[PDB]
């Protein structure tokens, strides 16, 4: 079951985060119990020891690449760009989070300018919603419908992922399993 979530070759960007529908599996937990050292396995809700006793039917598996110093915004209840615009996690969260350093997999010497996030937006995200729209978006008096210019901004930017950086700026691959019956 836990084959294409962890050991895949490509992870989509934050503003177009992936979403699986794993179902009709058995446990596939003796694998991540042996995951060590997978940086952080700070899961929330049910205890990690008591995982082979529940009967989840819709085990989700999100996945993306973010900066290391921004994985803290995945915890239920936070403030930030990735907590308000890109991906939302409700306060009453009932699921686990797994994160690990993936510098050796996605860090080009020139720079992988192929990871995107929305810097600006007028209205914060609702729980469990996508933000795939890329329309021009502005704040002011000029409607500037489609027409670019001042006060009308394009809400996309790219990550400067490089090998010879710090741990905080180094990419981290985060997979959150929002367990839900």
């Amino acid at each position, epitope marked *: 079951p836990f084959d294409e979530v962890f050991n895949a070759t490509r992870f989509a960007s934050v503003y177009a985060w992936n979403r699986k529908r794993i179902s009709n599996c058995v446990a596939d937990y003796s694998v991540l119990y042996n995951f060590a050292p997978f940086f952080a396995f700070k899961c929330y809700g049910v205890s990690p020891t008591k995982l082979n006793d529940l009967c989840f039917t819709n085990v989700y598996a999100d996945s993306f690449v973010i900066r290391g110093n921004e994985v803290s915004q995945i915890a239920p209840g936070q*403030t930030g760009n990735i907590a308000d615009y890109n991906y939302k996690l409700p306060d009453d969260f009932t699921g686990c989070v797994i994160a690990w350093n993936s510098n050796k997999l996605d860090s080009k010497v020139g720079g992988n300018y192929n990871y995107l996030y929305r*810097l600006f937006r*007028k209205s914060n995200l609702k729980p469990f919603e996508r933000d795939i729209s890329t329309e021009i978006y502005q704040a002011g008096n000029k409607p500037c419908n489609g027409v670019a210019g001042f006060n009308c901004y394009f809400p996309l930017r790219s990550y*400067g992922f490089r090998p*010879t950086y710090g741990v905080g700026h180094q990419p981290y691959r985060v997979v959150v399993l929002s367990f839900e019956l």
Partner: antibody, heavy 118, light 108 residues
């Protein structure tokens, strides 16, 4: 609409402390990588200070210890408790938002002026 | 520390194209951005990520950052966009932004 505003000017003798209370509109100050950028009266641009989303603060070589950067979420205001003033710091000060550090600066404030002279 | 070099004044002719180069040592490793400075309007971005274009800006600007030097070039100038231009490079060893020194552009 982003209209970063700098407040607090006046004149101060060498040694006094002035609080440059910046402003914000449309974006939370305690969610971004806000930073201070100076402008000498007719010379090259320089950097001042930076506050991270987590809270880490880094400073440049020439300005170390004398300068402190805070952040009040309750008022959307970012402060700059500048102390121990010298005679070579009379400049216009700008508020700059960097989306993520490996990038540049997109939003720039109007810029208030302080006169460090007698 | 990571001091950059830049010509003071363009000393250019109207109608033709002009080149502005930021000197230094090993700039190609990092990224470079560019700015425009009137005698004061809260300076605005014109070039970022080596050779990418901010939205809503005239396309006659360009960008090149290859190893020894990074270059910003203007072609078919309008003779009105005569202002100051600055380039910057970020650092990864210690968090320390470094800025340019000055470029004056004026066409008569």
């Amino acid at each position: 609409e982003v209209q970063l505003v700098e407040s607090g000017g006046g004149l101060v003798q060498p040694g006094g402390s002035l609080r440059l209370s910046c402003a914000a509109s449309g974006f939370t100050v305690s969610s971004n990588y806000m930073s201070w950028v100076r402008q000498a009266p007719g010379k090259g641009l320089e950097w001042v200070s930076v506050i991270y989303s987590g809270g880490d603060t880094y400073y440049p070589d020439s300005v170390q210890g004398r300068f402190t950067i805070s952040r009040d979420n309750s008022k959307n205001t970012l402060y700059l408790q500048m102390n121990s003033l010298r005679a070579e710091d009379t400049a216009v000060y700008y508020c700059a938002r960097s989306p993520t550090p490996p990038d540049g600066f997109d939003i720039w404030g109007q810029g208030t002026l302080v006169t460090v002279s007698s | 520390s990571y001091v950059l070099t830049q010509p003071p004044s363009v000393s250019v002719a109207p109608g033709k194209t002009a080149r502005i180069s930021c000197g230094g040592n090993n700039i190609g490793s990092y990224s470079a951005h560019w700015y425009q400075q009137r005698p004061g309007q809260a300076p605005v971005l014109v070039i970022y990520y080596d050779s990418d274009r901010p939205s809503g800006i005239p396309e006659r600007f360009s960008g090149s950052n290859s190893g020894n030097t990074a270059t910003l070039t203007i072609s078919r100038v309008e003779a009105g966009d005569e202002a100051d231009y600055y380039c910057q490079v970020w650092d990864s060893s210690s968090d320390h932004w470094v800025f340019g020194g000055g470029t004056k552009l004026t066409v008569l």
